[PDB]
Design a protein around this ligand. Sequence first.
Ligand code: DDQ
Ligand code: DDQ
Ligand code: DDQ
Length: 220
Amino acid sequence: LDFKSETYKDAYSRINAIVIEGEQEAHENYITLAQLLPESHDELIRLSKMESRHKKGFEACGRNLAVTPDLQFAKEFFSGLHQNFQTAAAEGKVVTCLLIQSLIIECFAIAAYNIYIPVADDFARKITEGVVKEEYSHLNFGEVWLKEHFAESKAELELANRQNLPIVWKMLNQVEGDAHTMAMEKDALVEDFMIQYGEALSNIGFSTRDIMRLSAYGLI
Ligand SMILES: CCCCCCCCCC[N+](C)(C)[O-]
Ligand SMILES: CCCCCCCCCC[N+](C)(C)[O-]
Ligand SMILES: CCCCCCCCCC[N+](C)(C)[O-]
């Protein structure tokens, strides 16, 4: 890998933008979640602040490689999940919000980490390991909550899955080339995503049967 090649830098501008914009949506989503869940406000605002600081780290990685982020590309990439989150929040559908932020986005991030980290540039490897270590000293707020409210949240979780899991496959196709340029394979990302998401769904309470069903709706 030539971290100074135009071709790397081109792909980085989109890929690093995605992580930057994702941290921004994470910050905003946690505040909206604090508002949907007033009894948990203090905790969620504390998480919001971590995600803002992490965004700064990722901004420094782009600066380190003299690349400016393609924020429009990043916004487009998140658009379908952003719009579904906003709609759900406006309807008070906190379960759907939590699926989007805490399952989909979360699992997408762990998988991205899992695939990116062995092929990262030094400066970014350091920053990213830092961020992930900090993240992993926490439990996943929405997984914990959904597990706690599983039986009553089950129908909305399935709708939310039907509506959002397909968007993930779209997101992955959009970055197949950039991922390859950065020595990350789409198939690898798909596999690791499905692993993190299945494991999260099982943890919150879904059966193997439910997981297979939720997966099948993932394919249309
Ligand atoms: C699957 C699309 C997202 C993959 C991006 C994962 C790599 C994290 C990169 C963060 N950064 C570019 C600052 O190093
Ligand atoms: C590369 C796609 C992921 C974008 C980065 C967003 C990370 C926010 C994760 C926050 N979390 C789910 C732990 O609360
Ligand atoms: C690609 C950079 C993404 C940052 C790492 C993703 C956050 C890990 C989530 C773990 N959690 C906080 C829920 O335990």
